[PDB]
Symmetry: C3
Subunit: 543 residues, 3 copies
């Protein structure tokens, strides 16, 4: 027949066998789910706070919290766009509490980090060309951005095993509190945009949705919850300490830049297109306008400090050791090809090394358009990196710089954008540059873990199936919900009740503007708590 005779003869007895072809269908707990949406109470350092009260005899349990936000219509002049994943960037803090106190809470950045491997959650929060590309308003009544609604998935420990992990409401009042970051953090704009009026007129319009469960004869049992706690080290300090560590499931270490010493203005931004190449291309495109000029005699509208040299017959312009090959086609007979040899330059001493952005170009080819009176570039050979695109404009014109610094046109400088994204990691927009050369984790006096390479980040990325992980030390490899989590146990008598993190940062060149980008060390500790349901919901720190 259809089965091969070799198989039939091989089969056609005494040993006890587990049934792999049938199973006894277990009757589950009688329940009924419902998607419930609630309007909050807004309160106003005049920080916006949204409060959602959940109290209903029939809402036995809940999970999968989703916060929706109504983004308004943006009208006026100038350039405006929203940061990618705008919804997550709105969040400063989220708290879930009962009458007995806080059950679970997370910092805005930590919620975002936990959802970074979820493409759907990230897309829902606001990742579109409509939202993230930098739109321009021409008249005071021109529409820059159309109104839109974003959805932020507040991932909680109650979602891990669906109904099994759900937050039970033992006839108690659950309060979900959401603290919002200033609108400055979620917006990318130029000087021409009236941010002053926008900041006044903007209001966060939130709504909290969750999956509620009406359970008939619920059999509540105690559980365990991991609560994240972060410590931010002092500016440019390679150390941070998490105190009162008694039962931790994990410890994450990362770096964040600090732009308080700057006006938060950057030359370029790629918009919705967020790849490393997109950031580089947007920067190169912004510089090329002033870098290669086709003019009738020496170019005008540039500072006296600018050194604009006419390209010789051979096409090669020498900027010290660096040779720039510039060849433009269809150049009018009355005009010549010019190169800005010091577009952006930095130096600490009057005759030492100089970081010149024009030296980072080797070949520039294109064709001059008679119709539009502009140069259309064909191919650019350069060495521009993600760090260059991540340099705040202030650092080019800083007191440390002996040169003018910014030798661009006033037209180009007016196109600069303010970027206040609250969740930037490393020293660049893509968190590409690893500035941690060594990591040392001490549990008291004893060295708990040490590494010279980011193998803890490699393990984090593999074990969580994420492409954007952090240097994480995982202590729990036991299946969640069905088992009590494995934790690092303290010894208060021996002074082993704290985790001290020490990093060795990379040594950067003083004549490179990135040296002055201030760094902050972020250490995240996941503490183990026991969820008790005896006379309301309550949590107790495992010690």
């Amino acid at each position: 027949g259809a089965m091969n005779n070799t198989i039939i003869n091989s089969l056609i007895d005494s040993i006890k066998r587990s049934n792999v072809f049938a199973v006894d269908s277990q009757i589950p707990t009688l329940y009924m789910p419902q998607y419930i949406s609630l309007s909050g109470v807004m309160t106003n350092d005049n920080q916006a706070i949204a409060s959602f009260e959940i109290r209903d005899q029939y809402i036995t349990a809940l999970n999968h919290l989703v916060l929706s936000l109504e983004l308004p219509e943006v009208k006026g002049m100038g350039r405006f766009g929203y940061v990618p994943y705008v919804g997550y960037k709105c969040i400063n803090h989220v708290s879930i509490s009962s009458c007995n106190g806080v059950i679970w809470e997370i910092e805005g950045e930590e919620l975002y980090n936990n959802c970074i491997n979820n493409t759907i959650a990230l897309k829902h929060s606001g990742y579109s060309s409509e939202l993230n590309d930098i739109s321009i308003g021409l008249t005071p009544n021109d529409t820059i951005k159309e109104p839109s609604t974003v959805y932020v998935y507040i991932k909680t420990p109650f979602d891990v095993e669906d109904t099994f992990s759900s937050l039970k409401l033992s006839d108690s009042k659950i309060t979900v509190t959401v603290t919002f970051n200033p609108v400055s953090d979620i917006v990318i704009r130029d000087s021409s945009f009236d941010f002053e009026t926008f900041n006044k007129e903007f209001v966060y319009v939130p709504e909290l949705s969750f999956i509620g469960y009406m359970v008939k004869n619920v059999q509540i049992k105690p559980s365990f919850i991991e609560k994240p706690r972060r410590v931010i080290g002092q500016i440019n300090q390679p150390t941070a300490t998490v105190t009162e560590v008694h039962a931790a499931t994990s410890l994450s270490v990362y770096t964040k830049p600090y732009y308080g010493n700057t006006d938060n203005k950057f030359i370029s931004y790629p918009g919705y297109s967020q790849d490393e190449k997109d950031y580089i291309d947007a920067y190169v495109s912004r510089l090329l306008d002033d870098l290669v000029i086709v003019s009738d005699g020496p170019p005008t509208g540039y500072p006296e400090s600018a050194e604009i040299v006419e390209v010789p017959e051979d096409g090669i312009v020498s900027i010290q050791d660096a040779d720039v090959y510039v060849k433009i086609d269809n150049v009018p007979d009355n005009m010549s090809v010019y190169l800005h040899t010091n577009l952006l330059m930095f130096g600490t001493r009057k005759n030492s090394f100089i970081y010149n952005i024009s030296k980072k170009f080797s070949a520039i080819t294109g064709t001059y358009s008679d119709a539009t009176k502009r140069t259309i570039f064909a191919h650019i050979s350069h060495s521009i990196n993600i760090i260059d695109t991540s340099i705040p404009v202030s650092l080019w014109t800083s007191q440390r710089n002996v040169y003018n610094g910014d030798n661009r046109s006033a037209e180009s400088k007016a196109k600069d954008l303010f970027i206040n994204d609250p969740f930037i990691k490393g020293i660049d927009f893509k968190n590409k540059t690893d500035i941690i050369s060594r990591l040392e984790v001490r549990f008291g006096n004893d060295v708990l873990y040490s590494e010279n390479g980011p193998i803890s980040r490699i393990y984090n990325e593999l074990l969580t199936k994420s492409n954007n992980g952090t240097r994480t030390l995982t202590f729990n490899f036991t299946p969640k919900i069905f088992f009590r989590p494995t934790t690092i146990t303290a010894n208060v008598s021996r002074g082993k009740d704290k985790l001290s993190v020490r990093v060795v940062y990379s040594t950067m060149d003083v004549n490179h503007p990135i040296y002055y980008v201030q760094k902050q060390l972020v250490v995240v500790c996941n503490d183990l708590y026991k969820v008790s349901y005896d006379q309301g919901v309550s949590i107790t720190k495992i010690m």
Copy 2:
């Protein structure tokens, strides 16, 4: 303290079995609808799962433009039924099978998603090969695949019949008027083969199980209501919209081919319009309708179409020639002097260089506001009775390049299902309101819970693990009249002077009913009531 061993486990001896990949040839029968029947009857085939239907696509020869719809294999399916002597065990509608497999990239790729299959190929001579023959594989996802051998269909001492109903070849093909579809429709035959993983089980211990059977109800044209009757034990309910193109000839201006992103659809449309939009001619252009308003671009480069300014600058234009702009390529209006929807007004800057060698304009950069809706407008709606203007002011050359698109699984009012046309959703169990929403939070939950980017407004009643538990369902009350699910939507009001306002809509409601699988004297299913 007593501790659970997390470092070692007792290796359980499983049921003695042997799997085999079995492929079968069907029986073809012919509204003259193609039906394939596969009979599975073998004493040694104890259980089966993972049904894969293969299709041998023929060589396409001749003249004109031709291409297959993306995921061609799934689009071929109209209906699939798995039945025994006692009747239907499980059945699904073609679109519902596709929806269940939309998150599976591998299944979608196997069904036919390649530049070879989906790009629009052109045949120059009557014997020129447009498309080479190919074999596509359609994964018929069934409830028997969920927990592999545990969920498998047991067919010990029973004849299982797998029936596949095929959609007309018109649905799976994108072609122009030049292509001889008449001959193709006659000459085309579906060549199917059904593969499945069969299990020869020694001393099988069969137990009863539960199965979710999908039921869809399609409402009438433009009716914002649909009702699913005799709902007694449902695990989920999905609501979506489908466009109806019966009032049209199913012809569209452009198609991107294999490249399926929203931008790909937009770029293909812009590219098709640019041929007539900016013209380099020796005096006023010819070959356009009298209704066309082709204006010469001034020295300034700016052409004003009412409130809209179009910047047109072309390089290397011959001294005897001028640059022209079609100011009303596609226009729509319900009244003489009302709001006019002009496609030429959706362009702000057009730059390029004229080629002396090829005697054509090579466009460099286009600044425009063209959307996914524009690319999804059937040509018929531009020239409809409701339009006071001519509508289609393109050249006869451009109109001849229009393609017929009859894809059976289109959702919403656009090719990417980007635009949400449902403003409100109301679901009623009997007469009482079961669920209501003003935002697509049920779609957001569906997309999150299923880890899908192409979800639907779904109400899930079952959050209990499948196979190992009896599914949680919405229970009926026949005495109280709660034995039906009524869906009512409020469609979002669009502008009357926009052609997409005239795309007819059909409401689709999908209900997953719970059934009990019994193996006492053959395989049989019983509706849970």
Copy 3:
């Protein structure tokens, strides 16, 4: 608030609690990421040995091999193969004092990790590593130093701590055999490979998640060990002997380039799509294909047939018409077409495989400033096979014509590609050269197919886009159950798996015909892991 319809519907049978669970106290343990430096030994094959013996390491899993790639300085073109880290591996073996516990061939480890995007990215997949960089001066930096991470996926990772390798006071030795550096590098003739091969050293480090278990309760387990048999060159048969309890059997083909210098005209670099391979090839040919010259072009062999494009624009190469139109061509210059850039034939007046005939339209604009043609649009029929033809086959003895009629400039840009994990007869494994597959268990036919339905099932069941014709015998959940296997009958001679394929035949006038094939058959045998007086494995028979 809950809807009244739901409340009324709810407000004796034994029910399983789906809203709460008893949190079981697990085995007391403490994990640790442990990194170890090896011992390097060296015909003259690099071998790394890692010894694991510690009282505080009871169990281990998730082996990750780090490799320090050095700074590459000098002249010429250089780049690393995609997923460089995996390509470095020739063999990996985990053994105890009682012998080998588990081992895998380099290609098989890569195949098992092909469905893991993270593992592949970690091993080295970046424009920095995989794009072909050029060194201009003898001290110019071609490639900056980098660290790659190779995830050695083992059966101990399946169910985390449950599947982990237990070290019952025994010494575990992890041995990694490395492929020559030639295999992981794409370079031109200009690049001093001789010095590079001498100066290059594999710098490995083995990381693993170690577990310190208090009062471990060890129980025996089951392990699947992969075995592969490589058939005789071009032979459509291969046999795996002593098959007693196998969980699966995979069949695939590999090309063999021993009859060539392993040089190829083009390479896309980091961009690895079929189109990227094609575009890179077209771009490399266009330099010599369309020439703007003051009179007939020079610097080409006498064998080259370079025809001036007529006023019409169409050049006829027998049956094939090539439309060539270039803008801004100087008055003193003309447009030329190389009508036989690459040509092949086994007979003097028979069928010719001409690469120039594979082009229908070539448009562009001449640049006065750079004195070169900037191509705008190319209409062609170039395929993945064309890009996969070794240069040697164009100039082979079988070819009556010269073959390679390109310029010396173009020929100097050719790259050596020695990637050890190539499948099929093309770089993308696009062409399916197996027409039929027959698998025999002893003398009886176990399975046969005319279409790759076993590959389709493999791709679906493993959620992979790069699967192989695989026969799976085990559909039982791993670790918690003893795997289901094919059962041998030694008395009936049913103790071996014999694979016979029917290959489709290529055209003899197409250079690809001369690409050698190798049939690869992979068998996963079932073994029992015993911990009684050290770790040991026993073949299930």
